[PDB]
Design a protein around this ligand. Sequence first.
Ligand SMILES: [Cl-]
Ligand SMILES: [Cl-]
Ligand SMILES: [Mg+2]
Ligand SMILES: [Mg+2]
Lengths: 264, 264
Amino acid sequence: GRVALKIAYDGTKFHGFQRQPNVRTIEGEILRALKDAGIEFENFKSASRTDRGVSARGNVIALSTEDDRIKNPMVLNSRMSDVWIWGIAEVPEDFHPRFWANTKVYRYYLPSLGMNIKKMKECSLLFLGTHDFSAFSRVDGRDTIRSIDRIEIWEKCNVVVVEIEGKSFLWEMVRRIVSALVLCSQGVLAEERIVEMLNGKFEKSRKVPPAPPEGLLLWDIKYENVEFQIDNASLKKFQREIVERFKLHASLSALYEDLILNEQ
Amino acid sequence: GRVALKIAYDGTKFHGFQRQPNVRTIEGEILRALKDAGIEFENFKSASRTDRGVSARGNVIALSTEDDRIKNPMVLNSRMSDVWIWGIAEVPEDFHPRFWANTKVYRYYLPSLGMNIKKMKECSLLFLGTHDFSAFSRVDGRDTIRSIDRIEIWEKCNVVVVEIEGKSFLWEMVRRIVSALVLCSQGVLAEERIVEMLNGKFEKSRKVPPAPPEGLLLWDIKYENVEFQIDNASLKKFQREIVERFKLHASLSALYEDLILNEQ
Ligand SMILES: [Cl-]
Ligand SMILES: [Cl-]
Ligand SMILES: [Mg+2]
Ligand SMILES: [Mg+2]
């Protein structure tokens, strides 16, 4: 039958999700583990081809196989690093992870140093609802009218987290919205100008550039009437290995922060 | 004449301070910049040979030269990366940075995840004053009686900072004290046992291992009756480049943290 697999990965260890020649990718990591495990499969599909540097908590792939070992994610996880399949769902054969009705959540982790959080939250309200998001996207032939269902901003220590929820996202859309939020928070980009841009009045040559990709996390993809069974062995490995690298960066971040002069 | 130079560096970019063959070191970086600049010098000395991975805000070197360009640190800083000479002092010819009366401050940046801070602060009081620090050091033939003048612990977001001040430190002494603080905070290492160890009663084969070196920062070295003139151009470059890498790690740390399951 067909299975959907919910996957986390450290995007900083890969050259993006989509398989490319001569470089390490998440899809290539997964396909190599499948090949090495001896699992024959058909109709491999992915919910989202995240860009180089972008991480995920709950991206989703789907594949069809008669090999019962696919139901134990550790068969593949033991053959991969920096990628963890931690949820599995049995799904109909016509399940397509990009086209089956779903909601996606992204989180962006923006260093808050010198940020006007209050004004950033005010700017964020402008992006709620249905707009032309062409000015806040990298064009790829898709219709640029999209709807943001939820946009929330909170503070973790040292960073601002921007959470955006919607049924579909244009290329680089979250990271380009985040950059506009930064510019709007520092008075450079007026709210009136954003409203114009969201209604299709902008200059393509001067679009706001995307925020750096390493701060973007694909938080979750929720499919209607689809639930994933969690594999505890896989989560334990995922958690063990993410805690290790969190500790290195938390320590280094705080050390670097203490070297920054107080006034700045 | 003789000059003392106050230097910061990102220890994660080097294989330690002391020059070694075939690897990048802080001393090698500085000596190469001196050679490339055409500055002839004698009697190069360093206050502290920090271990691989250890960073510094205010380590100190001293050298003697008649070349007036040494008074402008940008002559060397423009020929180095990840090292910044930001203070300079004219000193007597018999100034020796390791032996001239001084006080050193170290800070260690320990991830606070699952730490009992209150008990860690209680354990830290045991190390104040004069003790045998052999059990909390890597032996190198030096007398192991030392005095800690100050030991303070506070919380930055996500980490605990351990600040220790003293006139001299044994090899790996701060990092081994930090590990003992961790073990004592989690009930593994009793305060009574630490008091015994600080009085020379311990087993050399079971010494507490050093905390990871990347969390250690040589915060400052203060020489009596010696003041450094600050070079603003050098600080601006130091600050510009430390802020860049702080931002990457602050963002990544917060992203990794959000992937850690709540209960843990
Ligand atoms: Cl994006
Ligand atoms: Cl140490
Ligand atoms: Mg509109
Ligand atoms: Mg004693």
